[PDB]
Design a protein around this ligand. Structure first.
Ligand SMILES: [Cl-]
Ligand SMILES: [Cl-]
Ligand SMILES: [Cl-]
Length: 216
């Protein structure tokens, strides 16, 4: 059975980036948010958008920010460790499933790899037990089209789903994502898309009136 990806201190964040968090008011984020090593001024959220704590590396940022460089440095390091962990998993159960487009599929537990960009243009289901683990390795971008829902079935839990992407992630408007995202570049959400999962970007996270909830 596939091991979880240990997020370390990054597990405590709904959104964690390295070059900031952009936002088209109003979003609704549940969980802590942070960015490092960029200045906290690059976190463009307000306090009424975040249920939790906004962490900054310095004295800049939203009014409600907490300055804690050492925690952010550990979280971002742990985020990098998790990204490398997840990208380093060997012996995939699936390789280039659906030839890079996977609309309509039901995904069972395991390690999946794509040597291209992955597209999700219609609804999909992730199906498994409450202890099963999915790891999706994407060597290109990860795209999901407008209004696409990812449905969880059989007891599958968002906290046991990990998406590792070497390129940028784009979630289209009204879409609904499930699982943790470890992006090597950005994670870009569009108008009123939602995610039950974490947004861990090694560049920036950009939002447009999104709902972001940390997995329970
Ligand atoms: Cl850092
Ligand atoms: Cl990769
Ligand atoms: Cl846009």
């Amino acid at each position: 059975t596939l091991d979880l990806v240990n997020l370390g201190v990054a597990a405590n964040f709904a959104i964690l980036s390295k070059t900031g968090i952009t936002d088209v008011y109003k979003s609704a984020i549940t969980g802590d948010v942070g960015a490092s090593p960029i200045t906290g001024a690059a976190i463009l959220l307000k306090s009424d958008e975040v249920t939790g704590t906004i962490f900054s590396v310095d004295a800049a940022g939203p009014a409600c920010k907490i300055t804690d460089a050492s925690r952010l440095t550990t979280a971002v390091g742990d985020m990098q460790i998790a990204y490398d962990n997840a990208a380093g998993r060997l012996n995939p159960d699936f390789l280039n499933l659906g030839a890079g487009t996977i609309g309509g599929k039901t995904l069972t537990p395991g390690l999946y790899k794509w040597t291209s960009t992955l597209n999700i243009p219609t609804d999909i289901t992730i199906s498994g037990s409450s202890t099963d683990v999915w790891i999706f390795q994407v060597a290109g971008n990860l795209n999901m089209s407008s209004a696409v829902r990812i449905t969880l079935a059989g007891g599958a839990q968002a906290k046991n789903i990990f998406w590792q992407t070497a390129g940028a992630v784009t979630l289209g408007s009204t879409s609904h994502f499930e699982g943790n995202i470890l992006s090597q570049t950005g994670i870009n959400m569009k108008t009123a898309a939602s995610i039950n999962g974490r947004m861990m970007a090694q560049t920036a996270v950009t939002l447009q009136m999104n709902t972001v909830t940390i997995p329970q």
